[PDB]
From a paper:
The final model containing residues 403–526 shows four ordered sulfate ions, with one of the sulfates occupying the cyclic phosphate site due to a high sulfate concentration in the crystallizing condition. The N-terminal portion of the αC-helix (residues 520–526) forms a loop, providing crystal contacts with the PBC of the neighboring molecule in the crystal lattice. The rest of the αC-helix (residues 527–542) is not modeled due to the lack of electron density. The αC-helix is not ordered in the absence of [name], but becomes ordered upon binding [name] and shields the [name] pocket. In the absence of [name], the PBC is open with its αP-helix positioned away from the -barrel. The αB-helix, which interacts directly with the PBC, is tilted away from the -barrel. The α310-helix of the N3A motif interacts directly with the PBC. Three phenylalanines from different regions, F419 (α310-helix), F434 (αA-helix) and F455 (3), together with the hinge residues, L486 (αP-helix) and F513 (αB-helix) as previously defined in the CNB domain of Epac2, form a hydrophobic core that stabilizes the apo conformation.
Recent studies discovered that the [name] [name] (PfPKG) is involved in both asexual and sexual development and specific inhibition of PfPKG blocked progression of the life cycle at multiple stages. PfPKG contains an N-terminal regulatory (R) domain including a possible auto-inhibitory (AI) sequence and a C-terminal catalytic (C) domain. Moreover, the R-domain of PfPKG contains four consensus cyclic nucleotide-binding domains (PfCNB-A, B, C and D), whereas mPKG has only two (mCNB-A and B). Cyclic GMP binding to PfCNB-D has been shown to have the greatest effect on kinase activation.
Author numbering: 403 to 526
Write the structure that this text describes.
């Protein structure tokens, strides 16, 4: 309940999901799962092909390129959205800034199956 309503509230108001149907959105909310990181963990590694999208539940992360911090993201911020449409190398790294970081994430595998929904044929 609480975790569902939590990510529901965030997901539903996000720009990048504004075209989803309520049916799609519900599948999507249920598809997100929590993942935990400790201080200094690489959440995303620059140069790898991205396949996940992340929303910060607890904590902070930093976006890093060429060992330089580009910015800090905190609770309810999100990152990695291009991976949900494009198959391309990550342009930067994302590093867990503190212990006990928690993100909701979804893989493009799951997301695309959901976006595909309206293309699936009815019997009648």
């Amino acid at each position: 309940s609480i975790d569902y309503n939590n990510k529901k509230s965030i997901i539903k108001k996000m720009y990048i999901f504004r075209y989803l149907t309520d049916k799609q959105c519900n599948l999507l909310i249920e598809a997100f799962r929590t993942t935990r990181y400790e201080e200094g963990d690489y959440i995303i590694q620059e140069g790898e092909v991205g396949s996940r999208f992340y929303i910060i539940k607890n904590g902070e992360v930093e976006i890093v390129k060429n060992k330089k911090r580009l910015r800090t993201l905190g609770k309810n911020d999100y990152f990695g959205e291009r991976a949900l449409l494009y198959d391309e190398p990550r342009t930067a790294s994302v590093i867990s800034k503190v212990n006990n970081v928690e993100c909701w994430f979804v893989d493009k595998s799951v997301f695309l199956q959901i976006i595909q929904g309206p293309m699936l044929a009815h019997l009648e």
